[PDB]
Design a binder for this molecule. Structure first.
Ligand SMILES: *[C@@H]1O[C@H](CO)[C@@H](O)[C@H](O)[C@H]1NC(C)=O
Ligand SMILES: *[C@@H]1O[C@H](CO)[C@@H](O)[C@H](O)[C@H]1NC(C)=O
Ligand SMILES: *[C@@H]1O[C@H](CO)[C@@H](O)[C@H](O)[C@H]1NC(C)=O
Ligand SMILES: *[C@@H]1O[C@H](CO)[C@@H](O)[C@H](O)[C@H]1NC(C)=O
Ligand SMILES: *[C@@H]1O[C@H](CO)[C@@H](O)[C@H](O)[C@H]1NC(C)=O
Ligand SMILES: [Zn+2]
Lengths: 597, 194
């Protein structure tokens, strides 16, 4: 009778047609990943275009139904993500120019190699080659050699491609009625239609800039300690009052500082917690690993693995018969099919990663009852964050003594907690200023606040001021440094990694308080507590069917994203660093550079 | 001196799609319901209005065997007083229904690699089905006031939709062959007993 009845009829027709094609497209990528052959490429290409042409065909019909006359919110949200036409709005000529530039940068990133002038016949790629040199080498020049050469060759190739990439993505968003293309990425956090929960696309920038102001007290002392320890290993090449060199940060881009934990460890004579030597003597295999992981989610009340899971999933590298990518990915193929692809080795890290990839599966099985278009994370940052809180539960000394890995007589004290937090402080806190820096840079480029010639000039002004990192060698406008990074040239919005941090500690303080924990938060374990699982499962099943501001209020009891749990989690570390930093200079100036003497 | 032929009803290789659901009249024989219950090869076996131990010795003049194939999570939609797509638009049991419900896992047979599309179900119909009504009409569904004229298009949909079954699907998805038995007493004498 009305447009409402027609819409509910269309969206019902769309759901049962989508499961069949979307399952085909994901299963084809599965058969591509586990078994890599030319025959599997066409199977992924055909099934990938059939799904690409399906959403392209449905979007034409979906725009017929106006969103104005539909009062039902759950129906209104389904058409919202469906009626956005994406790249199809551009002309057919620029349509191929966009995918060409995207496919060109993807090959340059993967096939980009560095070649030493000494023996031009031998060259090295980034992975594994350059990633191993940056991490394990203590030499100044060797670390600088991989830092300059990677951005020298790759930077010259991607820059003329990237300048055209900015113009193309703008004309796409301008026809979508967005102020710029940066607003299109921020459109995931957009909330409208509910009184008091409305969260504007532009409120994100004002909120992130506010939340990052309170992390600086934690990060500046985290920087002053790392600069103090590495100063002994590099007396001439690191200034005490200046910013850290870029290539000394432990890897290529300085994203994760975990590699510095070896030199920056607070206490060397205290034993580090590792379950590796305990697992080898117990001779566990891939089967028993996830059974301990499946046993975890049963203790909180979440449902366990399906019987078809263990049969259809490939949990190990199937020998030399077929080649496969070992990058861990949690696959949701729909139709109640869930698979985890991992190359299993015996380590403490894989066991901690084991809960992560299984954490996503616990999240996907929860909203599986939701309709198709509503199957996703509530925002783009929850889906990754739910897997992170599970890894924090398995890294506590309480849980490792529960399943029998670590000896019961292991003696905890003040020196053990500080050693554990600093590892988590390098990974979790160390990546926040870099992420906020990268996003704030993109957002000013797409908006137009930065002219094309000031890109590299404004970049290293953000490097020095925000993150306190100075370039070891100056770069002119010919190089583009950020383009060489994975997420920059692959067209993936990188703000996900900042929000998952602020969300994981809110869940951590909310779920542990539901478990009635006593004492500091980093010693918390959600095992055996059924209250925590029920409070978490309330959000897990909702998916994106409800606004993320509403679903967040259930779990953490707050409508806004706040950093207060973060400083509460590292509160033991922050109190210890202030005493160690009283003899060290806190802060950095942007005027110093290694190449100016 | 004959056993009711449930052998061909349950062990048949091919059943009907839920809209095609096949009715088979059973009369003038003696049925053993204990071999059904005591087999323990059935996933879900429930009776309504009569106990399985009571129907073992008892006499009903008419026994209808309604067999079809539906999805796992949709089996709970077969019962008196239920809603959903299968209940309203496909196969509808009355509230007074006196019969039993039988379901077992067909995944080893019906589902095949790459999916089996021959199993179909009616996703849209203008109204709800009255108890025990088979409507096989393929006529185009009309969502709005726009004339369909038997061609698909905008606000006109083809009501029959197929279930993809692939052996790798999740268990709830995986096909179950459901056989609904009905029992009544009418003016005719009862030739069927224990
Ligand atoms: C992988 O694919 C190749 C060719 O596509 C095939 O010969 C081989 O048997 C496959 N491996 C497995 C384990 O199925
Ligand atoms: C929207 O429609 C769905 C399905 O028809 C229904 O479950 C939901 O309650 C409706 N929402 C409102 C606010 O009426
Ligand atoms: C998963 O849980 C169900 C019920 O909680 C149980 O029947 C099943 O055996 C469990 N899975 C395994 C592999 O034991
Ligand atoms: C959870 O309970 C089981 C059974 O009581 C016990 O074996 C295990 O150690 C407990 N784990 C924790 C972390 O308390
Ligand atoms: C179907 O065949 C099996 C195999 O012998 C048998 O046990 C079963 O009784 C048969 N079905 C019926 C309804 O008799
Ligand atoms: Zn993940």
């Amino acid at each position: 009778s009305t447009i409402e009845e027609q819409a509910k009829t269309f969206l019902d027709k769309f759901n049962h047609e989508a499961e069949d094609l979307f399952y085909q497209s994901s299963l084809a990528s599965w058969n591509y990943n586990t078994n890599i052959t030319e025959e599997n490429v066409q199977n992924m290409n055909n099934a990938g275009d059939k799904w690409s042409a399906f959403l392209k065909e449905q979007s034409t019909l979906a725009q017929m139904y106006p969103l104005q006359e539909i009062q039902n919110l759950t129906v209104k949200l389904q058409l919202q993500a469906l009626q956005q036409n994406g790249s199809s709005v551009l002309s057919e000529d620029k349509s191929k120019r966009l995918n060409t530039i995207l496919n060109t940068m993807s090959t340059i990133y993967s096939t980009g190699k560095v070649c030493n002038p000494d023996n031009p016949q031998e060259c090295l790629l980034l992975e594994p080659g350059l990633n191993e040199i940056m991490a394990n080498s203590l030499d100044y020049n060797e670390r600088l050699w991989a830092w300059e050469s990677w951005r020298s060759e790759v930077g010259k190739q991607l820059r003329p491609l990237y300048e055209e990439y900015v113009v193309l993505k703008n004309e796409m968003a301008r026809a979508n009625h967005y102020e710029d293309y940066g607003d299109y990425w921020r459109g995931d956090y957009e909330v409208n239609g509910v009184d008091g929960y409305d969260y504007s696309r532009g409120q994100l920038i004002e909120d992130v800039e506010h939340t990052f102001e309170e992390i600086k007290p934690l990060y500046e002392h985290l920087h002053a300690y790392v600069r103090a320890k590495l100063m002994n290993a590099y007396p001439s090449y690191i200034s005490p009052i200046g910013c850290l060199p870029a290539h000394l940060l432990g890897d290529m881009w300085g994203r994760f500082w975990t590699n510095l934990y070896s030199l920056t460890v607070p206490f060397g004579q205290k034993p580090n917690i590792d379950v590796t030597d305990a697992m080898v003597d117990q001779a566990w295999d891939a089967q028993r690993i996830f059974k301990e992981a499946e046993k975890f989610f049963v203790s909180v009340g979440l449902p366990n693995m399906t019987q078809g899971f263990w049969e259809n999933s490939m949990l190990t590298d199937p020998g030399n018969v077929q080649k496969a990518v070992c990058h861990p990915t949690a696959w949701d193929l729909g139709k109640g099919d869930f698979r985890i692809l991992m190359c299993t080795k015996v380590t403490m890290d894989d066991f901690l990663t084991a809960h992560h990839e299984m954490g996503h599966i616990q999240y996907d099985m929860a909203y599986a009852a939701q309709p198709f278009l509503l199957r996703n994370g509530a925002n783009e940052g929850f889906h990754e964050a739910v897997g992170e809180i599970m890894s924090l539960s398995a890294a506590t000394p309480k849980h490792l003594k529960s399943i029998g890995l670590l000896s019961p007589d292991f003696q905890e004290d003040n020196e053990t907690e500080i050693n554990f937090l600093l590892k988590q402080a390098l990974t979790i806190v160390g990546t926040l200023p870099f992420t906020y820096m990268l996003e704030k840079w993109r957002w000013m480029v797409f908006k137009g606040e930065i002219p094309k010639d000031q890109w590299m000039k404004k970049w290293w002004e953000m490097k020095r001021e925000i993150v306190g990192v100075v370039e070891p060698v100056p770069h002119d406008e010919t190089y583009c440094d950020p383009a060489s990074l994975f997420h920059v040239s692959n067209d993936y919005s990188f703000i996900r990694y900042y929000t998952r941090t602020l969300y994981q500690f809110q869940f951590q303080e909310a779920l542990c308080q539901a478990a009635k924990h006593e004492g500091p938060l980093h010693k918390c374990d959600i095992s055996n507590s059924t209250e925590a699982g029920q409070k978490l499962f309330n959000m897990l099943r909702l998916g994106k069917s409800e606004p993320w501001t509403l679903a967040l209020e259930n779990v953490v009891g707050a409508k806004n994203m706040n950093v207060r749990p973060l400083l509460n989690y590292f509160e033991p570390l922050f109190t210890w660093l202030k005493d160690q930093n009283k003899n060290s200079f806190v802060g950095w100036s942007t005027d110093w550079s290694p190449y100016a003497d | 001196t004959n056993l009711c032929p449930f052998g061909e009803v349950f062990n048949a290789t091919r059943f009907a799609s839920v809209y095609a659901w096949n009715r088979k009249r059973i009369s003038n024989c003696v049925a053993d319901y204990s071999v059904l219950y005591n087999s323990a090869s059935f996933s879900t076996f429930k009776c309504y209005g009569v106990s399985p131990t009571k129907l073992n010795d008892l006499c009903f003049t008419n026994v209808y065997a309604d067999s079809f194939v539906i999805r796992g999570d949709e089996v709970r939609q077969i019962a008196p007083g239920q809603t959903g797509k299968i209940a309203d638009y496909n196969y509808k049991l009355p509230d007074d229904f006196t019969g039993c419900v039988i379901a077992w896992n067909s995944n080893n047979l019906d589902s095949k690699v790459g999916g089996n599309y021959n199993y179909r179900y009616r996703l849209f119909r203008k109204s709800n089905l009255k108890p025990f009504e088979r409507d096989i009409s393929t006529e185009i569904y009309q969502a709005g006031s726009t004339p369909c004229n038997g061609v698909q298009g905008f606000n006109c949909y083809f009501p029959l939709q197929s279930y993809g079954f692939q052996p790798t699907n999740g268990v709830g998805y995986q096909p179950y062959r459901v056989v609904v038995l009905s029992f009544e007493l009418l003016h005719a004498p009862a030739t069927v007993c224990g």
